[PDB]
Amino acid sequence: RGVQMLLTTVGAFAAFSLMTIAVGTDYWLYSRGVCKEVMTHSGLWRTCCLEGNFKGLCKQIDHFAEYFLRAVRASSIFPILSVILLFMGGLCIAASEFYKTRHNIILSAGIFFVSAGLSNIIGIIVYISANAGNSYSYGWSFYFGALSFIIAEMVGVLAVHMFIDRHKQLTG
Amino acid sequence: GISIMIKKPQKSKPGVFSFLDPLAYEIWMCIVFAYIGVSVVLFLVSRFSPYSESTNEFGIFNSLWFSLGAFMQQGCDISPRSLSGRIVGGVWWFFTLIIISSYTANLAAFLTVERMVSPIESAEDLSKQTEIAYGTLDSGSTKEFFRRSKIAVFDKMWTYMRSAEPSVFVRTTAEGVARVRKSKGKYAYLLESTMNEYIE
Amino acid sequence: SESTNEFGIFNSLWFSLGAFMQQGCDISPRSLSGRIVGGVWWFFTLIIISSYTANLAAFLTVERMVSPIESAEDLSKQTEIAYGTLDSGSTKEFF
Amino acid sequence: WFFTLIIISSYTANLAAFLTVERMVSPIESAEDLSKQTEIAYGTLDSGSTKEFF
Amino acid sequence: YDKGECGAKDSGSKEKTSALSLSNVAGVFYILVGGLGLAMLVALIEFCYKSR
């Protein structure tokens, strides 16, 4: 009991709000490259150059068994899936006005936080293993996604313990 | 006698964390994520409705502890008894079974090839690791001496020196030793032994 | 006020010894402190015995071992290996 | 416990030996590997053209 | 060959390997995430198949 019932919303908000940076900004990776060689960084859809004549220039980036793995890497779906899962978990924890005090939705809410978690393990490993296909280093959007994963793993357990407090404690 | 000079090879100075070096940073970073990831599901499944908590001791804290011992091959005080509880344990072991075996395999790599090296010796060795370059003082007696000799071990050395580029000849001994100091390995120089053990 | 576990000095020694071996721990240090205490001593054992099992390959696969007396001079400065000369000749006079 | 801890480890090590030595050796080739070393002997048809040729 | 410009019969060097990469071990990580997702499938049955 206590206030901790409400901190679910703070945990969810923090878990969700970070993710938007990942699904498009170019700060995933530092390397040399081209905007056609020059210091470069690249997003999923685009690429930009720095410290040269192309400083501030940008271009599209593209990829068109390994064929299916290339397709999965280029569609990058796990970001979107985890985003939808986190959002639907937030919409679940909001459910104060139906199933009142049974809160079957609050029971279900853990599924989203877990699945959004497990999503990003595959997402990361696909992203890294394909991009590796040496001075290079990982850009901060990778750390942002990892941090979002950390808070998602926090809030899932927290929310499940809060369902245990609010309802399961009454069932014995 | 005609004698050989090379750069002193320096000595090993391991970094204190070098015990990680056989295995890549990404591996550890993925291990840590897996070690977290396995705990949350193992908990959540273990406290679905018995309908009583003595039905399943495997709460959050215990669902952490169980994973650590399983990752270290040190077992447990308790193990799950549900089907959906057990299956994760029935998977998590295999990951450790692979990865520690790979870590041992790579730990054998450096400890082998390294003890497989040998140095330069006897001048004859410069027939084989030929990418460590060598040459002579220019226009001096030794340069013509290599041309005039006709024994195969020297015939190779001459045949190389007669064609190598960039220039394998130096105007002075000072330029030679400077060149050896500059390349810091990968280069070797020729002169009379009386000068050699003087520079030494 | 942690007042539940069975542990004691000789039991802690016993738990330790197996924790340098690999037979399963037969008692539980059940506390967050005790869990942390295990959660590194395990890893330490797992590292070291792996390194030993790696290094025990080298001696079995790349023999060479130069040893007896490297300089042929410094054997002068010891008293186990004997040395001497042919007699009745200039080699003695040199010394 | 210690007896097992040694013996299984020392055994595993040995297994490497063959699985490594039998990959590091390979056959004689292109006359040069017949003449670098003479663990296997050879000669010619005697007084024939090839003997004088060598 | 005497004006050849490449290494011959042999060039063996055995560089210090850059260790084993993630791309080698990934085949474990996939089946791990598979098994973890698969556990929830039976979790959403074993204690609620009697529900309505």
XYZ file of C-alpha atoms in Angstrom:
573
model
C 0.000 0.000 0.000
C 0.923 3.665 0.249
C 1.751 6.102 -2.526
C 3.658 3.470 -4.546
C 0.379 2.655 -6.328
C 0.717 5.985 -8.172
C 4.453 5.768 -8.989
C 3.472 3.216 -11.654
C 2.493 6.190 -13.837
C 5.888 7.859 -13.349
C 7.706 4.632 -14.181
C 5.606 4.147 -17.321
C 6.072 7.760 -18.462
C 9.845 7.496 -18.002
C 9.980 4.115 -19.757
C 8.052 5.412 -22.772
C 9.261 8.991 -23.295
C 12.906 8.132 -24.094
C 12.230 5.827 -27.032
C 11.342 8.319 -29.799
C 15.013 9.290 -30.331
C 15.984 5.791 -31.479
C 13.558 5.315 -34.385
C 15.252 7.779 -36.719
C 18.022 10.008 -35.382
C 21.488 9.374 -36.814
C 23.418 9.220 -33.505
C 23.585 5.410 -33.508
C 27.206 5.063 -34.627
C 30.364 7.077 -35.279
C 32.559 6.053 -38.218
C 34.168 7.339 -41.368
C 31.949 7.216 -44.437
C 30.556 9.275 -47.330
C 27.695 11.578 -48.252
C 28.346 10.850 -51.946
C 35.831 9.604 -47.162
C 34.834 11.684 -44.148
C 33.712 11.409 -40.532
C 30.146 10.179 -40.602
C 27.154 9.071 -38.560
C 24.030 7.280 -39.765
C 20.434 6.639 -38.776
C 18.076 3.968 -40.047
C 16.810 6.037 -42.987
C 19.463 8.702 -43.536
C 23.106 9.656 -43.052
C 25.063 12.859 -42.431
C 28.698 13.961 -42.583
C 30.861 16.135 -40.341
C 34.368 17.627 -40.175
C 34.735 18.108 -43.910
C 33.376 19.739 -47.039
C 30.182 17.700 -46.503
C 29.883 19.074 -42.938
C 26.136 19.342 -42.392
C 25.289 17.569 -45.650
C 22.940 14.599 -45.415
C 21.688 11.805 -47.651
C 19.296 8.880 -47.651
C 20.579 5.425 -46.722
C 19.284 2.117 -47.976
C 19.781 -1.635 -48.204
C 18.325 -2.272 -51.684
C 19.024 -16.334 -45.184
C 20.870 -13.028 -45.546
C 18.038 -11.768 -47.778
C 15.507 -12.229 -44.973
C 18.014 -10.976 -42.390
C 18.647 -7.885 -44.537
C 14.872 -7.360 -44.811
C 14.460 -7.645 -41.019
C 17.364 -5.243 -40.435
C 15.937 -2.725 -42.916
C 12.394 -2.906 -41.509
C 13.747 -2.594 -37.932
C 10.317 -3.576 -36.650
C 11.183 -4.234 -32.979
C 11.465 -0.485 -32.174
C 7.876 0.014 -33.384
C 6.621 -3.133 -31.640
C 8.179 -2.181 -28.290
C 6.827 1.376 -28.680
C 3.297 0.050 -29.217
C 3.685 -2.350 -26.285
C 4.886 0.361 -23.880
C 2.070 2.689 -24.984
C -0.572 -0.023 -24.539
C 0.874 -0.793 -21.100
C 0.447 2.869 -20.219
C -3.152 2.737 -21.436
C -3.582 -0.376 -19.265
C -2.327 1.181 -16.031
C -4.761 4.074 -16.625
C -7.719 1.672 -16.229
C -9.287 3.088 -13.053
C -12.858 3.301 -14.400
C -13.669 -0.257 -15.501
C -13.316 -3.720 -13.953
C -13.248 -1.498 -10.849
C -11.242 -3.187 -8.048
C -11.028 -6.400 -10.028
C -8.794 -4.463 -12.462
C -8.258 -7.344 -14.898
C -6.486 -4.815 -17.142
C -4.006 -4.059 -14.354
C -3.406 -7.807 -14.067
C -2.743 -7.924 -17.823
C -0.504 -4.832 -17.861
C 2.681 -6.787 -17.063
C 2.483 -8.555 -20.437
C 3.259 -5.321 -22.293
C 6.247 -4.349 -20.143
C 7.730 -7.849 -20.410
C 7.190 -8.146 -24.157
C 8.572 -4.635 -24.763
C 11.607 -5.797 -22.803
C 12.222 -9.037 -24.675
C 11.652 -7.228 -28.003
C 14.749 -5.103 -27.628
C 17.179 -7.967 -26.973
C 16.504 -9.248 -30.495
C 16.351 -5.678 -31.793
C 19.808 -4.879 -30.399
C 21.420 -8.140 -31.492
C 20.029 -7.817 -35.036
C 21.131 -4.175 -35.239
C 24.666 -4.789 -33.943
C 25.315 -8.036 -35.831
C 24.117 -6.573 -39.140
C 25.981 -3.272 -38.724
C 29.209 -5.162 -37.976
C 28.930 -6.775 -41.430
C 38.695 -0.263 -35.332
C 38.155 3.100 -33.609
C 34.368 2.988 -34.062
C 32.112 3.452 -31.052
C 28.412 3.313 -30.240
C 26.443 6.559 -30.251
C 24.234 7.730 -27.419
C 20.918 6.567 -28.934
C 22.049 3.013 -28.137
C 22.473 4.080 -24.505
C 19.057 5.772 -24.581
C 17.439 2.551 -25.787
C 19.283 0.537 -23.140
C 18.117 2.974 -20.448
C 14.524 2.734 -21.706
C 14.887 -1.052 -21.457
C 16.156 -0.676 -17.872
C 13.160 1.409 -16.775
C 10.778 -0.943 -18.623
C 12.281 -3.852 -16.648
C 11.806 -1.792 -13.486
C 8.197 -0.808 -14.108
C 7.074 -4.281 -15.192
C 8.078 -5.862 -11.880
C 6.822 -2.823 -9.964
C 3.395 -2.891 -11.659
C 3.032 -6.642 -11.104
C 3.873 -6.198 -7.407
C 1.281 -3.394 -7.339
C -1.392 -5.692 -8.764
C -0.338 -8.212 -6.096
C -0.806 -5.496 -3.462
C -4.146 -4.183 -4.758
C -5.917 -7.444 -5.578
C -3.979 -10.691 -5.134
C -3.391 -9.834 -1.459
C -7.190 -9.972 -1.116
C -7.498 -13.376 -2.820
C -5.034 -15.236 -0.586
C 82.920 -10.483 -39.466
C 79.864 -9.241 -41.311
C 77.179 -8.805 -38.667
C 73.499 -7.971 -38.212
C 71.715 -5.309 -36.142
C 68.014 -5.088 -35.223
C 65.770 -3.102 -32.893
C 65.543 -4.321 -29.300
C 62.085 -5.886 -29.031
C 60.685 -4.054 -25.955
C 58.868 -6.193 -23.333
C 55.336 -7.249 -22.426
C 53.354 -4.827 -20.241
C 49.837 -6.247 -19.789
C 46.963 -4.016 -18.866
C 45.476 -5.083 -15.555
C 42.098 -5.982 -17.109
C 43.712 -8.039 -19.901
C 41.920 -11.176 -18.642
C 38.890 -9.911 -20.597
C 40.800 -9.558 -23.890
C 40.020 -13.076 -25.249
C 36.301 -12.147 -25.295
C 34.668 -9.124 -26.887
C 33.040 -6.257 -24.984
C 29.728 -6.845 -26.784
C 29.618 -10.390 -25.399
C 29.704 -9.156 -21.797
C 27.159 -6.417 -22.524
C 24.776 -8.992 -24.015
C 25.366 -11.452 -21.161
C 24.292 -8.789 -18.652
C 21.082 -8.062 -20.586
C 20.321 -11.792 -20.802
C 20.952 -12.187 -17.064
C 18.377 -9.490 -16.343
C 15.943 -10.688 -19.023
C 15.728 -14.234 -17.648
C 14.657 -13.060 -14.174
C 11.434 -11.138 -14.863
C 9.603 -13.926 -16.728
C 10.832 -16.585 -14.282
C 9.233 -14.519 -11.518
C 6.021 -13.525 -13.305
C 5.185 -17.100 -14.300
C 6.003 -18.461 -10.828
C 3.349 -16.298 -9.096
C 0.329 -16.850 -11.287
C -2.764 -17.831 -9.353
C -2.595 -21.057 -7.324
C -6.363 -20.720 -6.844
C -1.391 -20.050 -0.553
C 2.019 -18.574 -1.316
C 3.857 -21.695 -0.104
C 2.745 -23.136 -3.451
C 5.669 -21.242 -5.018
C 8.592 -19.826 -3.019
C 10.005 -18.326 -6.248
C 9.182 -14.677 -5.663
C 11.061 -11.742 -7.177
C 14.098 -11.987 -4.906
C 14.331 -15.782 -5.217
C 13.768 -15.453 -8.987
C 16.900 -13.306 -9.026
C 19.017 -15.578 -6.801
C 18.134 -18.755 -8.730
C 19.523 -17.203 -11.922
C 22.935 -16.218 -10.519
C 23.825 -19.701 -9.262
C 22.606 -21.220 -12.527
C 24.872 -18.851 -14.472
C 27.875 -19.742 -12.279
C 27.220 -23.530 -12.479
C 26.911 -23.505 -8.670
C 23.341 -24.811 -8.536
C 20.664 -23.636 -6.144
C 18.846 -24.193 -2.880
C 15.483 -24.380 -4.718
C 14.230 -24.988 -8.247
C 10.848 -24.415 -9.905
C 8.200 -27.109 -10.180
C 5.624 -25.768 -12.653
C 5.963 -26.667 -16.323
C 6.101 -23.031 -17.459
C 8.440 -22.349 -14.540
C 10.861 -25.185 -15.296
C 11.171 -24.637 -19.073
C 13.177 -21.431 -18.625
C 15.645 -23.229 -16.369
C 15.673 -25.969 -19.021
C 16.899 -23.302 -21.453
C 19.086 -20.916 -19.412
C 21.706 -23.608 -18.651
C 22.565 -24.199 -22.326
C 23.633 -20.564 -22.796
C 26.276 -20.922 -20.068
C 27.274 -24.339 -21.423
C 28.125 -22.748 -24.765
C 29.653 -19.470 -23.690
C 32.086 -20.678 -21.021
C 33.277 -23.336 -23.487
C 33.964 -20.658 -26.095
C 35.731 -18.525 -23.470
C 38.026 -21.474 -22.702
C 38.635 -22.130 -26.398
C 39.705 -18.530 -26.985
C 41.757 -18.562 -23.758
C 43.808 -21.312 -25.429
C 44.480 -19.219 -28.564
C 46.898 -16.600 -27.219
C 48.473 -19.162 -24.873
C 49.385 -21.259 -27.920
C 50.340 -19.247 -31.038
C 52.407 -16.932 -28.752
C 54.607 -19.823 -27.468
C 54.966 -20.687 -31.355
C 57.151 -17.586 -32.438
C 61.033 -17.750 -32.273
C 63.305 -14.769 -33.198
C 66.004 -14.003 -35.821
C 68.769 -15.845 -35.951
C 71.846 -16.857 -37.947
C 71.034 -14.500 -40.884
C 69.542 -17.549 -42.632
C 66.195 -16.745 -40.988
C 65.930 -13.675 -43.257
C 65.155 -16.150 -46.063
C 61.664 -16.753 -44.643
C 60.145 -13.847 -42.684
C 61.287 -11.669 -45.591
C 58.712 -8.929 -44.884
C 61.046 -7.683 -42.156
C 63.164 -5.627 -44.532
C 66.956 -5.432 -44.654
C 69.724 -3.947 -46.774
C 73.311 -2.644 -46.707
C 75.471 0.417 -46.513
C 75.585 1.827 -50.033
C 78.615 1.522 -52.338
C 80.691 0.041 -49.514
C 82.597 -3.214 -49.804
C 79.750 -5.315 -48.377
C 77.349 -4.303 -51.161
C 79.693 -5.542 -53.883
C 80.564 -8.584 -51.750
C 76.929 -9.735 -51.800
C 76.825 -9.309 -55.590
C 80.074 -11.219 -56.126
C 79.225 -14.161 -53.858
C 77.330 -17.071 -55.412
C 76.041 -19.281 -52.563
C 72.265 -19.728 -52.643
C 71.681 -18.425 -49.106
C 73.377 -15.192 -50.171
C 72.034 -15.480 -53.733
C 68.528 -14.921 -52.334
C 69.642 -11.906 -50.282
C 71.335 -10.367 -53.324
C 68.404 -11.181 -55.628
C 66.079 -9.320 -53.239
C 68.443 -6.374 -52.624
C 69.019 -6.064 -56.406
C 65.295 -5.392 -56.953
C 63.643 -4.210 -53.712
C 61.959 -0.806 -53.501
C 61.974 1.743 -51.915
C 65.740 2.255 -51.661
C 67.418 -0.373 -49.487
C 70.752 1.502 -49.389
C 71.828 4.327 -47.082
C 74.550 6.935 -47.476
C 75.967 6.560 -43.946
C 75.955 4.192 -40.991
C 74.286 7.015 -39.053
C 71.460 7.034 -41.612
C 71.238 3.248 -41.231
C 70.926 3.175 -37.453
C 68.534 6.137 -37.684
C 66.400 4.090 -40.099
C 66.396 1.186 -37.631
C 65.393 3.592 -34.845
C 62.630 5.000 -37.076
C 60.937 1.764 -38.159
C 61.215 0.272 -34.632
C 61.247 -3.255 -35.935
C 60.291 -4.380 -39.430
C 63.772 -3.298 -40.547
C 67.327 -4.581 -40.149
C 70.767 -3.291 -41.074
C 74.177 -4.677 -42.023
C 77.693 -3.598 -41.036
C 80.995 -4.893 -39.626
C 80.811 -6.569 -36.211
C 83.354 -4.154 -34.708
C 80.941 -1.269 -35.306
C 77.932 -3.404 -34.318
C 79.075 -4.234 -30.789
C 80.242 -0.630 -30.420
C 76.804 0.843 -31.169
C 75.309 -1.843 -28.905
C 18.867 -8.585 13.892
C 19.186 -10.983 10.959
C 18.034 -13.945 13.002
C 17.002 -16.876 10.812
C 19.929 -18.687 9.216
C 21.737 -21.794 10.486
C 25.269 -20.613 9.734
C 28.371 -20.861 11.901
C 32.138 -20.628 11.605
C 32.903 -24.235 10.661
C 29.796 -24.323 8.463
C 31.085 -21.191 6.717
C 34.424 -22.941 6.144
C 32.545 -25.959 4.774
C 30.468 -23.799 2.423
C 33.678 -22.073 1.323
C 35.583 -25.226 0.431
C 32.913 -26.539 -1.921
C 32.738 -23.008 -3.337
C 36.331 -23.419 -4.450
C 35.333 -26.834 -5.812
C 32.210 -27.281 -7.940
C 29.986 -29.691 -5.977
C 26.664 -28.068 -5.206
C 26.386 -25.883 -2.116
C 24.472 -27.852 0.519
C 23.354 -24.858 2.638
C 21.994 -21.435 1.745
C 23.656 -18.152 2.820
C 20.201 -16.670 2.342
C 20.624 -12.920 2.713
C 21.302 -10.164 0.200
C 24.768 -9.814 1.727
C 25.408 -13.559 1.572
C 24.119 -13.655 -1.997
C 26.609 -10.939 -2.960
C 29.318 -12.883 -1.091
C 28.643 -15.898 -3.308
C 28.107 -13.834 -6.460
C 31.800 -13.062 -6.892
C 33.648 -15.950 -5.239
C 31.843 -18.192 -7.736
C 32.927 -16.082 -10.719
C 36.495 -16.013 -9.363
C 36.624 -19.819 -9.180
C 35.065 -20.130 -12.647
C 37.697 -17.792 -14.102
C 40.710 -19.418 -12.474
C 39.951 -23.077 -13.153
C 39.219 -22.123 -16.775
C 42.565 -20.340 -17.065
C 44.360 -23.369 -15.603
C 42.610 -25.700 -18.059
C 43.663 -23.390 -20.894
C 47.305 -23.130 -19.811
C 47.669 -26.912 -19.373
C 47.511 -27.101 -23.186
C 50.810 -25.272 -23.816
C 53.239 -27.780 -22.252
C 51.472 -30.621 -24.098
C 51.607 -29.045 -27.577
C 54.634 -26.760 -28.147
C 57.772 -28.263 -26.613
C 61.118 -26.546 -27.176
C 62.717 -25.527 -23.857
C 66.218 -24.139 -24.297
C 67.779 -24.248 -20.853
C 71.134 -25.676 -19.771
C 73.578 -22.735 -19.922
C 72.807 -19.752 -22.103
C 76.056 -17.781 -22.277
C 78.706 -20.520 -21.819
C 80.400 -17.858 -19.669
C 78.175 -17.769 -16.582
C 78.670 -21.482 -15.866
C 81.961 -20.172 -14.445
C 79.956 -18.636 -11.576
C 78.423 -21.847 -10.182
C 79.573 -24.960 -8.343
C 77.262 -27.777 -9.489
C 78.395 -28.213 -13.106
C 82.069 -29.179 -13.275
C 84.443 -27.885 -15.936
C 88.049 -28.464 -16.901
C 90.525 -28.767 -19.736
C 92.696 -31.065 -21.746
C 96.126 -31.373 -20.134
C 99.665 -31.145 -21.511
C 98.946 -28.277 -23.885
C 98.631 -24.552 -24.467
C 94.985 -24.521 -23.330
C 96.241 -24.863 -19.747
C 98.872 -22.154 -20.281
C 96.159 -19.760 -21.492
C 94.434 -19.936 -18.100
C 36.714 -33.220 -4.870
C 40.222 -31.950 -5.681
C 41.208 -35.258 -7.300
C 38.388 -34.901 -9.840
C 39.166 -31.201 -10.268
C 42.691 -32.036 -11.389
C 42.178 -35.217 -13.368
C 39.256 -34.186 -15.581
C 41.094 -30.956 -16.431
C 44.414 -32.628 -17.246
C 42.568 -35.185 -19.396
C 40.643 -32.566 -21.367
C 43.926 -30.813 -22.096
C 45.571 -33.907 -23.616
C 42.594 -34.371 -26.031
C 43.716 -31.116 -27.729
C 47.095 -32.704 -28.654
C 45.962 -34.994 -31.504
C 43.095 -32.727 -32.586
C 45.862 -30.132 -33.101
C 49.014 -32.000 -34.217
C 47.053 -33.914 -36.891
C 45.974 -30.534 -38.319
C 49.493 -28.931 -38.283
C 51.167 -31.716 -40.459
C 50.455 -32.146 -44.171
C 51.903 -34.043 -47.140
C 55.072 -33.736 -49.194
C 54.680 -31.436 -52.188
C 56.252 -30.039 -55.372
C 59.754 -31.551 -54.910
C 60.791 -28.751 -52.533
C 59.103 -30.557 -49.631
C 60.868 -33.758 -50.738
C 64.274 -32.035 -50.490
C 64.051 -29.595 -47.570
C 64.040 -32.752 -45.430
C 64.857 -36.434 -45.894
C 62.681 -38.361 -43.460
C 61.662 -40.220 -46.638
C 64.492 -41.424 -48.876
C 64.588 -41.377 -52.673
C 66.887 -41.657 -55.674
C 66.649 -42.335 -59.420
C 66.751 -45.017 -62.020
C 70.476 -45.686 -62.057
C 72.809 -44.327 -64.759
C 69.763 -43.239 -66.761
C 69.312 -39.815 -68.312
C 67.635 -38.369 -65.204
C 70.615 -39.223 -62.987
C 73.035 -37.320 -65.211
C 70.442 -34.539 -65.537
C 70.470 -33.942 -61.770
C 59.299 -14.792 -60.055
C 62.553 -12.838 -59.643
C 60.514 -9.768 -60.612
C 57.433 -11.106 -58.884
C 55.665 -8.671 -56.575
C 53.720 -10.943 -54.206
C 54.425 -13.524 -51.545
C 55.200 -17.044 -52.680
C 54.314 -20.567 -51.487
C 53.882 -19.342 -47.904
C 53.270 -16.153 -45.927
C 52.140 -17.480 -42.514
C 51.830 -14.789 -39.839
C 49.018 -15.793 -37.419
C 47.972 -12.325 -36.317
C 46.565 -11.677 -32.851
C 42.889 -12.482 -33.434
C 40.333 -9.796 -32.556
C 38.532 -12.333 -30.306
C 35.272 -14.150 -31.061
C 32.455 -11.789 -32.040
C 28.774 -11.499 -31.124
C 27.898 -12.615 -34.669
C 29.427 -16.007 -33.841
C 27.451 -16.575 -30.612
C 24.110 -15.055 -31.734
C 22.695 -18.527 -32.492
C 22.406 -19.077 -28.755
C 20.866 -15.695 -27.950
C 18.057 -16.218 -30.459
C 16.962 -19.561 -29.052
C 17.196 -18.075 -25.551
C 14.746 -15.310 -26.454
C 12.629 -17.963 -28.192
C 12.400 -20.088 -25.069
C 11.628 -17.052 -22.923
C 8.788 -15.980 -25.221
C 7.584 -19.599 -25.341
C 7.323 -19.821 -21.545
C 4.710 -17.039 -21.439
C 2.641 -18.958 -24.009
C 2.116 -21.818 -21.562
C 1.967 -19.389 -18.626
C -1.202 -17.910 -20.172
C -2.725 -21.421 -20.067
C -1.529 -23.501 -17.121
C -3.411 -21.492 -14.456
C -6.295 -20.003 -16.470
C -7.533 -22.638 -18.956
C -10.532 -23.088 -16.620
C -11.408 -19.384 -16.845
C -14.398 -18.062 -18.780
